[PDB]
Structures are given as C-alpha cells and as structure tokens.
Amino acid sequence: PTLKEVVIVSATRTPIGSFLGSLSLLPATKLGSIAIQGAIEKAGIPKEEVKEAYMGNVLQGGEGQAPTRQAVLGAGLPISTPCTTINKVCASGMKAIMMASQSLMCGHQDVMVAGGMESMSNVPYVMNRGSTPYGGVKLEDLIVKDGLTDVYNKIHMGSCAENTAKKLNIARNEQDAYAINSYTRSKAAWEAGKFGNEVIPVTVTVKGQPDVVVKEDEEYKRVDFSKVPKLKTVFQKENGTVTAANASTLNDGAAALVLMTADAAKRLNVTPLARIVAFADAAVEPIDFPIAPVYAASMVLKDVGLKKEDIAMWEVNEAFSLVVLANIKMLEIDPQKVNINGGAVSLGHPIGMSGARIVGHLTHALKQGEYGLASICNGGGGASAMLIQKL
Amino acid sequence: PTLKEVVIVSATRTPIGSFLGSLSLLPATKLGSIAIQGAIEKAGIPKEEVKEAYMGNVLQGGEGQAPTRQAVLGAGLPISTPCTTINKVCASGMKAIMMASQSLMCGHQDVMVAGGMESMSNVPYVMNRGSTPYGGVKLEDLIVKDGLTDVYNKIHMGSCAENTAKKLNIARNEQDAYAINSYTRSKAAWEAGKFGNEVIPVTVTVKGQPDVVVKEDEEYKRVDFSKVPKLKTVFQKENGTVTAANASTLNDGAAALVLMTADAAKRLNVTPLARIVAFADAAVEPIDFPIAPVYAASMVLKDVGLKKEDIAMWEVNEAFSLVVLANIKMLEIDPQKVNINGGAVSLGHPIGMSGARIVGHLTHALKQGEYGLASICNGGGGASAMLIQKL
Amino acid sequence: KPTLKEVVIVSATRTPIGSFLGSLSLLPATKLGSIAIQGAIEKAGIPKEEVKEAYMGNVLQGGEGQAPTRQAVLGAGLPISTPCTTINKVCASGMKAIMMASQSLMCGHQDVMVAGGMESMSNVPYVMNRGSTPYGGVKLEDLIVKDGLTDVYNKIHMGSCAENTAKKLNIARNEQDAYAINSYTRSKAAWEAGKFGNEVIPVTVTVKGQPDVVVKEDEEYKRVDFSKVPKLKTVFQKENGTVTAANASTLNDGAAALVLMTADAAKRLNVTPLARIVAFADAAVEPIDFPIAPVYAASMVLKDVGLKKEDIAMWEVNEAFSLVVLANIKMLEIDPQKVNINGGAVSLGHPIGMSGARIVGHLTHALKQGEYGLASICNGGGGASAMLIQKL
Amino acid sequence: SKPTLKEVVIVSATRTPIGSFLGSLSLLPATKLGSIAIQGAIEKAGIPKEEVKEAYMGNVLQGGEGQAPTRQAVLGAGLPISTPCTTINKVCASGMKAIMMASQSLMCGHQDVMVAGGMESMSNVPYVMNRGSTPYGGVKLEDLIVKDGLTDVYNKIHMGSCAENTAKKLNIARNEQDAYAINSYTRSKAAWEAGKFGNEVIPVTVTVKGQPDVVVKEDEEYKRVDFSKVPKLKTVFQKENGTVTAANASTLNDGAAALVLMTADAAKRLNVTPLARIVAFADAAVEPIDFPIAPVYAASMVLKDVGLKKEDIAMWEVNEAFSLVVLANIKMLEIDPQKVNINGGAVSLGHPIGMSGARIVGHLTHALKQGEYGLASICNGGGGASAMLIQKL
Ligand SMILES: [Cl-]
Ligand SMILES: [Cl-]
Ligand SMILES: [Cl-]
Ligand SMILES: [Cl-]
Ligand SMILES: [K+]
Ligand SMILES: [K+]
Ligand SMILES: [K+]
Ligand SMILES: [K+]
C-alpha cells in the first residue's frame, strides 16, 4: 500500500498563563483536556471518530499515571482511545504531530489528536530515595533539573545559548531589539483579534470566590521596554548577552490538533485547514542547540524541492531571541516573514506545548496556497521542523 | 511510495535487578546505554548506521534532560542522532518499537534503535511547589503516584486486578499456582542457558571496591513456595487474591532492538532474526486493564488473517498472575504455549522496559517460520500487541 | 530560713505581638529578643555593660541556630562577656526565666540580669527524621504541632485537653465566647487609652526595594468579628465542643525583656525600681489537666507570703484558652473585674515562650504604688508557674 | 552584705553508657535515656521518688522530641505528676548549667530535694525544612546537628574550625593533640577494665521485637580507634596547616546523666549519706571563636571566689570537646597533666552534648577521695563556659 495524505482539520489552544499566574491552579492534564475538547468541537466531527492520541509533555513528575490518558478521558473521548505521552524536550508538541502523521500515513489510524501540554507552575521538587546524608541535602527543582540544564555541559540552556552568541557575533543589543519586537508583535496581534479562531477562553473556578475568565495570553503585558537594556545578564557574568527579558519565560498551556487522512476528511464531509507536507529532525552538539533548527528546516526544504523564498511564513520557536537571530542569519531569510504574530519570548514557553502551538498558528494565519515552515530547538542539541500548505 | 517491510536484526537486554538490588547504583539511562551498545554490537553494524532512537521510560522525574538522548550519547552514538522518550506506562517498551516501525514503514529512516529502560530503585519522592501547609508537608513516592495508582478509581493497580478476579472468577489458589509455575519456568530457562544470546552482563564499578559482574536476572531466586499460600493479600485485606508473590515486583533493567527496513538489512548484509508482521493498541475502561491485551491480540490476528492456533509462542506480560489467567480464560489458548520461559511475576517488571523485553525474547526463542505474539497491559486501561515471524 | 538579696524590676519592655505569618514574620525570634533586650536596657537607664547575665524563654528552638539567647544578647549590643541560657518550660518559659534569674540574684551570684522570652511561630520549621525514606512516602511534621501544641501522653492537642476541663467544671461555649469578646473589648480599650505607652516599643521592618513598615501596636486584637464568634465551629472537638479559634489563643510572634537587679544595685546605679519580686512557685497536675495547674501555683504563692486572694489588686492569668481563665476564676472565687483587665493572649496572641514574661511586665506598669499583682501561666505537660510582685 | 544560703550536697550521680552515633543506643530517644538515668540516680540515693521536688535537664537539640522534654524524662521515670520540670540549653554547658541552677534553688531554700542532669540523642536529631513558599531552584533540608549544634553563628564555621584558631594562637600542634587523644583512649580503656565505672554507669537493655535483647553495659566509643591510623588522618576542619582530626576531636553520641541534689538538712532528715558538697560555680564568656579558652576564666573565677589555689585541686575534669581545648587549658592554667581527665573523657568516650557537663561532675563525685577538691569545667558554643568546684565528703 502507498502512503496516505495527512491534513490538519482544526487547531486549538488555551491562553498561555504566566508562572504561578492566571492558570496555575490547573494541572497540565486539565489544560490538555480543554485544548483537545476545543479542537474536536472546531473540527465538527463526532468525538468517537478520534481513534488515538499523542500529547507532548516534558515534566511529567507528579502529574499521576498516563498524562495523555488523563487529558483524553477528561475531554470526554471514548475509553477505547489508546494514549501515549511524548518527550523530545522543547520539541515534544511538534514531534507528537509528526509521529501521529506517521501512523496515519501507514493507514494504522484514519483520525488522531496530537498536541502538547505543560504546567510549569505545578512541576514539583524531588528528594532522592535512600538514606539522608549527614549535613543535609537540597531538594532539586525539576524545572531546572529535567527541563533547563544540559546534562553534558552541566549548565543552563541560557548559558549554552551564550556560546552561539559568541560564535556568531550576536550582541546583547540585537537580542534586546528582537525581544522588544516580539512583545510588540504579540500585543498588535492580540489587539487585531488575530487569535479568535485559535485560542479558547478558560474559566477558573474557586469555591467561595468569583469565576475568573482567562481569555488572552498573560505574558506579553509583563514588560517595560525602558527597563529591557538595564537587566543583568543572568546566565553569564562576564561578556553576557542573554537576559530574563530576551529569553523565553516559564509558563502553563496546552494545544491540540485534529489530524486526518484525506480519505477520512472526504468521508466525514470536513473541509481541512492545511496539508502536512513533510517534516524532519536534526541534532548537533548539545551546547549548539540554537543552530539545530537551521539543519532541520534545510532537510525539509531539500526533501520537498522548495527554496526558502517559497515559504510565506516562518515559525522559529523563540526559546531565546538569540535562537531566532542565529536562524535568520544562517538561512538568510526576510525577518518580516518570521514569527509575525509574536512568539515564546513574549507569549511564554510551556515547554511541552510550544511545538504544537506554532504549527497550529500557521494553520490559522497562512493564506490559501501558501507554505509555512515551523521549527523548534530542543535540549540535548536537537530540533524538529515541519512544512504545511494552507488549503 | 509503498510501505516498507520492517525486520528485527538484534535484541539485547541487561539482566533485571531487584528493587534496591544488584543494579540499583546505575541510573536508567546508563542501563539504556548498555543495552543499546550491546544491540548494535550483536547486529554487526557501525554505530553511525543508527539513524534515530526511541526509548520507553515511565518514571522520568529526576533523570535529567532528555533521557533517551542521554542513553544514546552514553552508548557513543553520533551527536547527529535524534532521540525521543516514550511513555505509554507499562506498554512503553513495546510502543517504542511500534512507533519506530511506523517511521521505517514510511521510509523516513532506514535503521533505528528502539527499546525501554527503567530504574525503579532510583525513582525519587516529590514535594509540591508552593506554600507549606500548616500541620505538615507530604512527600509522595513517584513509583506509587505516577507508576501504580489508577487516576479515575483512586486505587492501586493490584486492586484493579482484584476487580477482574471477581468478575472472571479467578481464585487465589489459581493465581498462586500460576506464580509458582512462572518462578519454576524462569529457573528452568536460566539453568538451560536460554538467555545466553539475549542477556548481556553488567559490570558495576565502585571507587575503591572490587568490580561486580551481574550476569543473571536477580528476582527469580527470591521466593519460598511453602510460604506462597500463607502470604497476606495486601491490596484487599478481606477475601483477597493478589499477593506480593503472585504480583510482579519493582525492578531495574533495559532492553534494546536494532530495527531496519528489508532494503537496509540487504544493503548492510546482516542476517535479520524476525520480521515484524503487525501490531495494535486497544483500550478499555481503566479498571479493566487486565483484559485489554485480549482485544489488542485479537486485533493483530484479525489484521493478518491468522487464528490463535497459528501462534507458536505467546508472551502476555505477567503484570499480575491474574492478568495471564484472565487472558488464557478469554482467548481459550494452550497454557503450555504461554510465557514458556517465565515472566514478570518471577523475573521482575521495570515498567518501561518489559514491553521491549518480551518482543526480544520471542525473537530469540522462536524457531524458523514460527509466529510469536506479545501483548502487554498498561495503566489507564490500555494494551499494546505485536506479531512477529522468525526468519 | 535563708537571708536573701531583695530583687526588683527596673524596666519591662516588649515588641508588639505579630500575627502568624503577619507583620513581624520576617524577623527571627532572636532578632525580636534583641529588640526587647535593647529596649529594656534603654528604659532602665543603665549602661549595657552593667547587665551581668541573661536568661530567655524560647520553646521552639529548632532551626534558630546555636545558642538563641546568646544571639539575642550579642544582637542587642551587650558585651561578649555576658553568659546566656535559653529556658524551656513550654508556655511558662518567659516566667520561669524571670524566676530563675531572681534566684541567682537572691544568692548574690549576680547583681543585674536581663530575663524574658521570645518566640517566632511564623518561622518554626518542619522536620524530617534522620534515616532512610520509607517506601510510599512520608509526612514531614510541623514543629508547632509536634513540640508546641500536642500533649505527649494523651496524643491530642492542648485545645482537646481543655475540652476535658470544660466538661468537669461545666464551663459552656456561651461563657467561653463571652469571655473572649470581653478580652478583645479590653485589649482595644487599653490600646485606645494609651495603656501600653511605656511597655511596648515599635519595630521598623525593612525590606530592600520596598517601603519601611513601622509596627507600633499588637496586630491580633483587630482580627475578630463579634457577629461570627458564636457561629464558629469547634475545631478540637466536633461532638459537644466548646473551644473555637476565636475563644482560644492564636499563633504569634514577639519578645519581652525585664531588667532585674538587687535592691542594692539599684541604689548604686541611681535608678528607681518599678516593683519588688516577692515570691513565685511552680505546680503540676495530670498532663490533661493543665488548665487548673495555675490555681495551685497561685495558692502556693499566697500561702508562702501569708496573703489572701482579696489582697491582690490585679491578676494576670494567661489566656491560653478562655476556658483556662474561667476555670481559674471559678476555683479561686475571685473578682473577674480584677482579672486580665487590659486584655490577654486570646485577643493579643500567644508567642508561647514570651507570654510568661509579657504578663509580669504588664503588672509592673499597670499596678498602683503599694498594690500586689499576681501572674500565673499554665504549660504543656500539666504545669504552671506563678509570681507575686509589689509596686514600688 | 552576702546572703546566708543553704548548703547543697550531691547524694548520687548516675549515667547511661554512652552510645556511638547510629550505634548501640540509637533506637532510644533522648527522653528515654533521661528516664533511665533519673531512675538510676534515685534508686542509688535510696530515697523515695516522691521526695524529689523538681527537675532540670540539659538538652541542646530539642527539635522533634515532643512537648516538654524534661517532663517526658521525669514522668517516664515514674516520678509524681506533681513534679515541675524545665529543659535547659547552654549548648555544650547545658548538663552543668542545670546542676548550677538547681543548686541556686536549693541555696534559696525554694526546694529541699531536686534532680539535675542532661540528655542527648544525636542519633535521633532530625533535618528541617523552612516554613513558607518553596523558592525557585530548590529547597534546603538542613541538618540540626550542624545548624543548631556545631556551627558558630557569628563566624559561620564549625566548632572544630574555631578550635583551629586557638591551636594557631597558642602554638598547639597536631602531634601534641594526637598524643592527648591517644592518652584519653588509653585512660578510658584502663578505667573500664579496672571496673572504675562500677557505681557510676548503669546498663541499658535494648529490646527489638523478634530480635534477641541487647544489653549495653559499657561505653561504646573508646573501642573505636586504631592508634596506627591516628597520625595519618586528614585535618577535616581546615585545608591549610590544620591540626584537628576526627580522632583527636570529640564524636557525636547518645547518653544521659542525672544527679540527686539536696540541702544538708534534707540529707539528714532522709538519713542518707551525701557524696560531695557543691562549693562554688561560675560562668564566663569570651569572643565566640575563642570558646576553647572560656573554661580558663570560669575556673579562675571559681578559685578566686573560694580563695583556693590551682595547686589545691586534687582532680580536674576539663571537657574534652577537642584535644586542643584540654591542652590550651593545661597550658594557660599551668596545672599538672597527671591530674586532668584521669579516667578518660569526651574525645574517647563521646560527647552527647547536653549530657557531658553533668557526666563530668558525676565523675568527680565518684572518683575523689574523702576531703579532696575537684574542679570541673566545660566550654560551650557561642564563646561560653561553666565551671564547678566540689569537695568529697
Ligand atoms: Cl534530539
Ligand atoms: Cl492507553
Ligand atoms: Cl512542668
Ligand atoms: Cl554563654
Ligand atoms: K521574556
Ligand atoms: K512476585
Ligand atoms: K482568638
Ligand atoms: K575521637
């Protein structure tokens, strides 16, 4: 049998909440359920049609058994739905979509949900099993230990990024200009109503207090442009460039897509939003993660036979402003086509979610016939990339 | 393009260590490295031929960033190798092989490594992020919270087993006889030298201490048959059936397979061990996970037009003695063909590893031309299954 | 019968009492101690170098660092030659400190001492046992609950022990609630009347990048709603309860310190003493029966000096629970209008190591020349301390 | 004018064996060891339990012991519920300060009979987590032995690190310290084998269900040494030019001591033979880093107060917190080393910190001959010391 064609029929997300902020009372799995239910409703299909589900999720500790199963059953999908939780660090939300697309291509399912989720607010601390050492011990923060420290270099991702800043001569002022640009694009996009088909609101309910309706991203309002060039370079004391403002932040969120074969969309009288054309993974030295998305994108372009000029919009995940700048520079692409409506530096980075969010954003924002290319770096030196065409 | 045929070229595992036992000093990722290196060596190929790696791993908290990447880089594979860590609870090791097979089928890669790893000895305790409540702070055990507790019913997996024992009328004495039979068959297989090609020895090195070489599974010797019928029923104190002897145990270990397209196997002139014929996932009501493998197994047989009599060897993961008995009862298959060389009740159950182990064991044990079927239940009500044919 | 030095109080000063996790919660108990000690020496009008030795009550010492009293004393700018001892008689600690200091002075072993109490319940930690973590997890215990508030022998809270006395003496919820509202009413009236002008010193809380906060009065007494008082649920006993959050004492932060000296030393230093310490005693009963131990301790002191209850102008019976004060009133048969007249621990709060010192300090200021004041304080384990002073 | 005080005598002094850290007595909480010593002392004194009027116990690391540690020890020994109790903390000096404060009450005539002593279970001291919000990046669990017991607040370093400062100042080298340490072990073994603690120490039965009873009858720590290894050990408290080692410093331990104290009049009334009279005592303090020299001043204060000369003292007990401390005291006071710590001390017997001040006073009581004077001194964290002079009856 030949490979099946895969289409995106809907793509939906929660707003992104700030660390210990507006969505911090909700577990990752509950945000998961909200996004999945929303995506199914938007697709207009019976929920029974969804055959299987993959969700990205990096910091699974303390979330309870089978996080994807919790999200799926919490969304009211049938108990017959198999579930798998995916961890490619920062690339998790994209890799879930890629893996689901592989199952569909093989004809192993005809309809799936794929996406990502993360509640950094609820990630716990850990104590080693065993006897306590004389003199005491520090219980580690799993955001730091599992999420943000490179194993091999024993330093923060932010300190790894400094290496690329040095090698490619990307200065503090340029990184700060990029970050201000992201905040500006995010605000403009929200004010133009550009997220109306993408984001669904969340109602946070507390006993004995009034409901809070969270309807937009929280992070992009937390900025003061006049203070941006005043911040300390917290990942490197001497000759540093990366700051809290020009780096991504810690956040909570979930996103979900309904994926089908072309045959299934036809059978169900669904008009799909976009076609999944191709995808790829690349890896380089762990310290050099900022540059892996260049190679992953180049792989996809070469596979399909497109030139960079053929791409209408780029989503290069804003793990740090430095990452986007390194990518624009190496690929020599028009900066006006890159992260047009903001990104992780200003919208925030719930790590397991962002790779799904950026694909969902292209699905809504591209115009008919246009190609969009999303790419996302990950801890350990990896990246994933994906090319879609709007239908 | 047409779908590619997938073959298993090698299948290797560490011995399985007991909880806080012979392998407890090694992190899961290090066991992973050991199995991966061993599988590549047994396949007779250069490490550079391995294109991408997926490993099952359920309890990832505190292991550090990107566990699969740590396993792969730790085995000396190229920095160019993309890695993804897979969590379908107890089914994780088999689902990793299934998902890698799908990538190979699509022609997206030609050689991959897939398997699973777990060090339950090193799984930590957690403390919640936030304000310390008045009156005390609880530190939860991630083995219990994420590993072994059903979310929806708020009971241990062993209490779900008790529920199936009720519904299917599977008694304590029946579960005890099965367990004694598992311990018996494990010892017989080790004595017969049946793991000589499957298992590779682990050298444990401690500064200022003599090297310890771990060459065989630890768990199967930890039993007293005279005491089996006297043990307390820990999941249900009154009229119970499940005990520590007749349930699987907590353990440490890793397993890894080298998988290739038929075309790659020919190009590299390797001798494949088995072909992957079919695989499937099923899911049922969470409390009924013991019976999910019955549906998964039925799906694979129907998919390829084989009847249950056509299967020479069954591996139904021994999560509990109850599970195997339930499967035999529903499928009406010959017990003499099931878990013939022991299983998880007597060999142990490093949860993310077991689904890979049982597929590897069929690859070694089957005679040329024979079909083997492996199935494995998972927390949340799921199961995975795979059918292979020995070459 | 021994011939002893006469012991006088020259000053008695305290911080305001802060609410749990409230206005003074950023300050360690030892820092509150330094503030009270410095304040009392200033009020005494003596050189810091004249203080020979220091004793401080402090019940929950875990995580405060080595030698809490030493930290408070050196932190107050007293000489490195000053010996220090930290005292623990649970709730009675602040009073027992004064008693033991008085005993050294009587023996002529020192001529001038500082004695008091300190507690920061906001900063009391949780504990984890030494050893290996059990499979399945563990609860780390709260030291306020484990060391401060739980009876060892009955394995229940002090509040539950108090329910026992409520039963035996027929002291009902209504009477307890009425006593509590009275305490809150009296605390407010005293604060408004400026009755704490000489006793309390303000504390300035400083946080980098934020404005200063001057805490100049007790925080707790304003945290009440009289309308809700009779509607509160009984936390220590669901079945036939009487004790509630409102009519029991609360968790709090504060410190108190008194400058004590021999009558001779006061003359040498040309300072006018405020009061004379006449007598003091400890008593104990069954652990569960701690509410009634103060009756026996007070009687011992009266019998020792040969006075009668009517001779006492002012009583301070520590308000650990409203129940406690009512039990004492009933058994002693004293005039409730002479008891805790300017409020107490039910409305002002109860930093456990400090309250015993606070109540003696209050008598010192409030008594009129020539009058006798009796202070008594129950403690965890079935104990009580009591003290008689006479205004000078 | 000086007050006219009652005379105070020691009628008994009893202790548990001292257990090693996580060693033979580690299953027993401090308060239980307290109960055993308190019952011991009463039984030895030959008086009814109801005669004891009030109790003071030294105890430095009280976290997690439960409410009112001294009350627990007392009620656990079967004393009347009518017995008032107070727990004392002068760090390392606690066990001696308890006896002094009880002596002051008796002198005043406020009680006629009391029990005073000290207790510590370092094996059972817990770890702590702070109340509040968990800070991003991790949460510390501190060891209370280190945080409350052994760390100087002001200098932010270990007691042993402060000790190095006096080693420097008084030129006391590694070899002299090691010689002292070996001397302590030698004395301890000699005394134990001679049966010198026959009336001082009482045995402890450890019961574990299923296990055979363990009877701990002698001090555990003194056998834990190898003299050939002593000179080879690393100086763990200072990188450069260190002198303090695990071998020549005191160890972490468990134990309790209790003394029955009464007025001369009560001993007559009760027809019991007093062991010693408590003559004088004092507290001294210096710069916190200089705690090893504090006992020098406290001892001098006592001798000056009673009008005695150093030469008049038959037996000295200078607490062996560190070998360094004893040598610094031998140096500054210029006393006869053969008269100091005759039957061993904390370097070889161990240092359950709230107990040790009581143990050493209890030791003089048993060891002195009729009419002899003994001086006991003990340094404490923060730069203090207590000292006591007694005379055998
Ligand atoms: Cl990767
Ligand atoms: Cl599932
Ligand atoms: Cl008491
Ligand atoms: Cl001191
Ligand atoms: K930012
Ligand atoms: K078993
Ligand atoms: K209250
Ligand atoms: K030693």
Q: Do C38 and C77 contact (CB within 8 A), yes or no?
A: yes
Nearest-neighbour CA in chain D from A121: distance (Å)? 10
Query: Which residue positions of B form the known binding site for K(+)?
Result: 183, 244-245, 247, 345
For tokens 């969009």, what's the residue?
A: A372
Task: Determine the distance in angstroms separating the CA of A387 from the nearest CA of chain D, rounded to an integer.
Answer: 37
Going from the Cα of D213 to the center of ligand 7, the distance in angstroms, rounded, reads: 50
C68 CA from centroid of ligand 3 (Å): 22
Cβ <8 Å between A129 and C131: no
Q: b/e string for C25-52 if b means 16 or more Cβ within 10 A?
A: bbbbbbbbbbbbbbbbbebbebebebbb
Nearest chain C residue to D128, by CA? C127
Give C312's strand partners.
C372
**A131 lies within 8 A of chain C by CB:** yes
- Considering the domain A152-193+277-388, what is its CATH architecture? 3-Layer(aba) Sandwich (3.40)
How many CB pairs lie under 8 A apart between chains A and B?
214
Instruction: Name residue D116's beta-bridge partners.
Output: D56, D259
How far apart are alpha carbons C230 and C220 in whole angstroms? Answer: 19
Closest-approach residue (CA) in chain A for B119: A129
Helix or strand (DSSP H, E) at B101: helix B92-105
Q: Which two tokens stand for residue D42?
A: 């009463």
CATH for C1-126+195-277, options being 3.40.47.10, 1.20.1250.20, 3.40.140.10, 3.30.365.10: 3.40.47.10
Contacts of B311 (CB under 8 A, 6+ apart): B301, B333, B337, B371, B372, B373, B387
* Phi, psi (degrees; rounded to nearest 5) at B380: 95, -5
Give CA A83 to chain center in angstroms.
20
Residues in B touching D139 (Cβ below 8 Å) = 127
Whole-number Å distance, alpha carbon A88 to ligand 1 midpoint, is 6
**C-alpha separations of B232 from B164, B244, D35 in Å:** 19, 8, 39
Give B106's DSSP letter.
T
Q: Which ligand is nearest to the CA of B87?
A: 2
Q: For residue B195, give Cα distances in angstroms to B30, B316, B358, B390, C280.
A: 21, 18, 12, 17, 82
- DSSP character at residue B34: H
Q: Are strands B274-283 and C7-14 parallel, antiparallel or unpaired?
A: unpaired
D228 and chain B in contact, CB less than 8 A:
no
Domain with CATH 3.40.47.10 in chain C: 1-126+195-277, 153-194+278-389
The CATH classification number of C153-194+278-389 equals 3.40.47.10
The ligand minimizing its distance to the Cα of A52 is: 2
Backbone angles phi, psi at B389, to 5 degrees: -125, 130
D3 touches chain A (CB under 8 A): no
Query: Tell me, what amino acid is at D339?
Result: K
Asked if C131 reaches chain B (Cβ–Cβ under 8 Å), the answer is: no
Q: Evaluate the CA torsion angle D103, D108, D113, D114 in order and state its sign.
A: negative
Residue A226 corresponds to which tokens in the numbers above? 């006049």
Contact D129 B132 (CB under 8 A): yes
Chains contacting B (3+ CB pairs below 8 angstroms): A, C, D
Give the chain D residue whose CA is nearest to the CA of A147.
D137
Residue A28, classed as helix, strand or coil, is: helix
Nearest CB among D134, D136, D140 relative to A136 is that of D140
Q: Helices A172-191 and A321-331 meet at what angle, rounded to 10? A: 100
Q: Tokens 């879930």 correspond to what residue?
A: A96
For residue B160, give both structure tokens. Answer: 């779900």
For chain B, residues classed under CATH 3.40.47.10 are 1-125+194-276, 152-193+277-388
Cα torsion at B146, B152, B154, B160 (round to 10°)? -90
Would you call D227 an interface residue with chain C, using a CB distance cutoff of 8 Å? no
Active site residue C161: no
- Chains contacting chain C through 3 or more C-beta pairs under 8 A: A, B, D
Q: Could you give the CA distance from residue C235 to residue C230 in angstroms, rounded to a whole number?
A: 13
Q: How far is D207 from D180, CA to CA, in rounded Å?
A: 37
List CB-based neighbours of ion ligand 2 within 5 Å. Answer: A 82-83; B 283, 382
Q: Are B201 and B214 in contact (CB under 8 A)?
A: yes
Structure token pair of residue D82: 């009518």
Is A56 within 8 Å of A352 (Cβ atoms)?
yes
> Of D68, D65, D82, D94, which is closest to residue C89 (Cα–Cα)?
D68
Class of domain A1-125+194-276: alpha beta
The verdict on a CB contact (< 8 Å) between A132 and D141 is: yes
DSSP A163-218: HHHHHTT--HHHHHHHHHHHHHHHHHHHHTTTTTTTB--EEE--TTS--EEE-S-S
Tell whether D127 is within 8 A of chain A (Cβ): yes
**Exposure string for A150-179, b = 16+ CB within 10 A, e = fewer:** bbbeebbbbbbbbbbbeeeebebebbbebb
Binding residues of B: 183, 222-224, 227, 244-245, 247-248, 345
Residues of B carrying an active site annotation: 90, 377
Q: What are the chain C neighbours of A131 within 8 Å (beta carbons)?
A: 131-133
Q: Which of residues 80-99 of B touch A (CB under 8 A)?
A: 80-89, 95, 99
Contacts of B62 in chain A (CB under 8 A): 61, 126, 128, 140, 142, 145-146
Residue A32 structure tokens: 């998961």
Helix (H) or strand (E) holding D389: strand D384-392
Which H helix or E strand runs over D259?
Answer: strand D253-263
* Other chains touching D, judged by 3 or more CB pairs under 8 Å: A, B, C
**Chain A residues lying within 8 Å of D146, measured CB to CB:** 135-136
CA distance D181 to D166: 17
Method of determination? X-ray
DSSP state, residue D154:
T
Q: Quote the distance between the C-alpha of residue B214 and its chain's center.
A: 19
| CA–CA gap between residue B97 and residue B95 (Å, rounded) | 5
What count of Cα atoms within 13 Å lies in the side-chain half-sphere of residue A162? Answer: 17
Answer whether A253's CB lies under 8 Å from A15's CB: yes
* The listed CATH number (3.40.50.920, 2.40.50.140, 3.40.190.10, 3.40.47.10) that belongs to domain D154-195+279-390: 3.40.47.10
The domain defined by D1-127+196-278 carries CATH number 3.40.47.10: yes
Amino acid (1-letter code) at residue D243: T
Collect all residues of chain D within an 8 Å Cβ-Cβ radius of residue B127. Answer: 134, 139
Are the C-beta atoms of residues C7 and C102 closer than 8 Å to each other? Answer: yes
Domain with CATH 3.40.47.10 in chain D: 1-127+196-278, 154-195+279-390
Residue B200 Cα, ligand 1 centroid: separation in angstroms?
27
CB pairs under 8 A between A and C: 12
Distances (CA, A) of A271 to A9, A64, A263, A266: 7, 37, 12, 8
Neighbouring C-beta atoms of residue A306, cutoff 10 Å: 16
Separation CA A176–CA D41 (nearest Å): 76
Q: Classify residue C340 as exposed, middle or buried by CB count within 10 Å of its CB (0-12, 13-18, 19+).
A: buried
- Nearest-Cα distance to chain D for A354, in Å, is 22
Q: Is A247 annotated as a binding residue?
A: yes
Amino acid in the structure at residue A37: Q
Q: Is D132 on the interface with B (CB under 8 A)?
A: yes
Helices C68-75, C29-44: inter-axial angle, 10-degree rounding: 50
* All residues at 6 or more sequence positions from B359 whose CB lies less than 8 Å from its CB, including other chains: B8, B11, B93, B94, B97, B257, B315, B374, B386, B388
Considering every ligand atom shown, identify the ligand nearest to the alpha carbon of residue A220 and give its number.
Answer: 5
**Contact residues, chain A, for D136 at CB < 8 Å:** 141, 143
In sequence order, the β-bridge partners of residue B373 are B314, B387
| Tokens (6 digits) for D28 | 């027993």
Asked if residues D38 and D117 have their Cβ atoms less than 8 Å apart, the reply is: yes
